[PDB]
Symmetry: C2
Subunit: 197 residues, 2 copies
């Protein structure tokens, strides 16, 4: 089985007006697909040729790692959002956030601050750390908490300029605000359950 | 004198269709201006408050350096381009590129390769090294050859996504091709002459 672009769990216009169908079209069909295509080009006729994405992520370095990790990161980004989502958390993730951050609003303010403050290309993460505490992390470029052994990812938000430039230009703040309307708490709950078990 | 945004030496539509009017307006009036404004905000009421950009570049770290460096980098980028420019080099820079790269075409293909393969936010540089040889360099985020002590800058091209996303989206290759129509060989000659003297 060749490594492939996993399917979005919703339509290309499903996140609008918060993220436009045009953005998803480029972000998914050009950027995300391109990472898959480029990785497959790089590993062809190498000892990594028949490896799974998981194996590649563990073993590889350089541009091979960068493309592989971007594939994984973008799939986690799509899964971290959806239609008829956003708002206040619910379920276990509501308990866990209010516990570890005091309140949802405290978390949301800190997470927004990190997303808005990140310099250059990268990612913001909600993750569960080794002490089973929720933490906010940020990574540069293709970095993530799995590769960096800093925690188990629960949610992520992309802050590469290509994630928002079409809809928001330089106004990353407006993008981050829009993103809270999309956050998939069901995905967070599933990741949290699996992370604790 | 407070640190200020240097004036552009050309109109905001002087580089179209290679770089659009809209790109210059966001890139200069929002991004570059923003680095000036953020720098000035950060040094206010600190020991760096009344320092010049030059002083701040040699002393500072973290966000302060990032903003200061980006101010310098963008000013260098605007000066590296112009209307009625582009094409084959001329003057001393022609001789120098011919010698150090064998030909203009070899330099151009290498520099294009470096500009296109750079992962994440960054810059490509033509620079004079300590052996008075021209070299191709790349830096991440706000990095530049002065800070990194790797060479004296001659020309630069911005490859942060915001430099090209408005006009080309993910197609950095088209942006890089367009940029060769803009490269200011007169600036390259002035830089090379000051660097050798
Ligand atoms: Mn992305
Ligand atoms: Mn820029
Ligand atoms: Zn032209």
């Amino acid at each position: 089985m060749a490594i492939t672009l996993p399917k979005l769990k919703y339509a290309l216009n499903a996140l609008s007006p918060h993220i436009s169908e045009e953005t998803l079209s480029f972000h998914y069909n050009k950027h995300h697909a391109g990472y898959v295509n480029k990785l497959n080009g790089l590993i062809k006729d190498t000892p990594l040729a028949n490896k799974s994405l998981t194996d590649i992520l563990k073993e590889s370095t350089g541009a091979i790692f960068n493309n592989a990790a971007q594939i994984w990161n973008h799939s986690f980004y799509w899964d971290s959002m959806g239609p008829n989502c956003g708002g206040e958390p619910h379920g276990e993730i509501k308990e866990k956030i209010q516990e570890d951050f005091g309140s949802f609003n405290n978390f949301k303010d800190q997470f927004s601050n990190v997303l808005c403050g990140h310099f250059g290309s990268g990612w913001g993460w909600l993750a569960l750390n080794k002490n089973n505490k929720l933490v906010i992390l940020q990574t540069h470029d293709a970095g993530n908490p799995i590769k960096e052994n800093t925690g188990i990812p629960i949610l992520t938000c992309d802050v590469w300029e290509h994630a928002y430039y079409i809809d928001y230009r330089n106004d990353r703040l407006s993008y981050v605000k829009a993103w809270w309307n999309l956050v998939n708490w069901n995905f967070a709950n599933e990741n949290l359950k699996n992370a604790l078990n």
